């Protein structure tokens, strides 16, 4: 899924994201929770536990989880459409 | 300095960047070297050892150095002007 998000009619994105790995080092950045308020709740397509692959062409597959947050924060301060590429995970 | 870089007439940016901290944890992301070839050599304003504060509004003050590289890589693949905010360091 690509979920292109409005932002003009909404203002906040409304997700926490989280890092998750096994002891082998495999994992990535996931949708933590979706706030009852924001763009992502409103679009409805993304779910908790889905993997975040990309945001406006910035890849998140190997992002540190503290960078992921501050980088999504910065992108959310850029005015305009926010394009999430997402792997649907089924919980 | 803000150095807004052409990219249409150049193609590659032409810097390596590096992380650097003292034992107290203070430091950041720096210009590693400037390639004799790219946009940054051509613009001429930035120097090795200068600190990278921001790139197209993505803050680099706390970026991990492996994220910094892959994030600058991604931004450099977005077509268009690349805006570097930079602290001049004097070597």
Curated annotation (Swiss-Prot), chains A, B:
Domain of life: Eukaryota
Domain PDZ: 2-74
Tissue occurrence: Expressed equally in both animal-vegetal and dorsal-ventral directions of the early blastula. Becomes enriched on the dorsal side of the embryo after cortical rotation. Expressed along the anterior margin of eye field of neurulae (stage 16 embryos) and in the anterolateral crescent that borders the eye field. Continues to be expressed in the optic cup at stage 26. Expressed in the central nervous system throughout the early tailbud stage including the entire hindbrain.
PTMs per UniProt: Phosphorylated. Phosphorylation is controlled by frizzled proteins, correlates with the onset of embryo dorsalizing events and is higher in the dorsal half of early cleavage embryos. Phosphorylated on tyrosine residues in response to association with efnb1/ephrin-B1.
Cellular compartment(s): Cytoplasm; Cytoplasmic vesicle; Cell projection, Cilium; Nucleus
Self-association and partners: Can form homomultimers. Interacts with prickle1. Interacts (via PDZ domain) with ccdc88c/dal and dact1-B/dpr. Interacts (via DIX domain) with ARP/Axin-related protein and dact1-A/frodo. Interacts with sdc4, possibly via fz7. Interacts directly (via DEP domain) with efnb1/ephrin-B1 and indirectly with the phosphorylated ephrin receptors ephb1 and ephb2, via association with SH domain-containing adapters. May interact with lrrc6. Interacts with custos (via NLS1 and NLS2); the interaction is negatively regulated by Wnt stimulation.
Biological role stated in the UniProt entry: Involved in at least 2 independent signaling cascades, controlling cell fate via canonical Wnt signaling and cell polarity via a planar cell polarity (PCP) cascade. Acts synergistically with dal/dapple-like to activate Wnt signaling, stabilizing ctnnb1/beta-catenin and leading to dorsal axis formation. Also prevents degradation of ctnnb1/beta-catenin by displacing gsk3 from a complex with ARP/Axin-related protein.
Family: Belongs to the DSH family.
Free-text note on domains in this protein's UniProt record: The C-terminal region containing the DEP domain is required for membrane accumulation and phosphorylation. Wnt signaling and axis induction requires the DIX domain. The C-terminus contributes to the localization at the cilia base.
Protein name: Segment polarity protein dishevelled homolog DVL-2
Taxonomic lineage of the native organism: Eukaryota, Metazoa, Chordata, Craniata, Vertebrata
Parent-protein residues present: 254 to 343 of 736
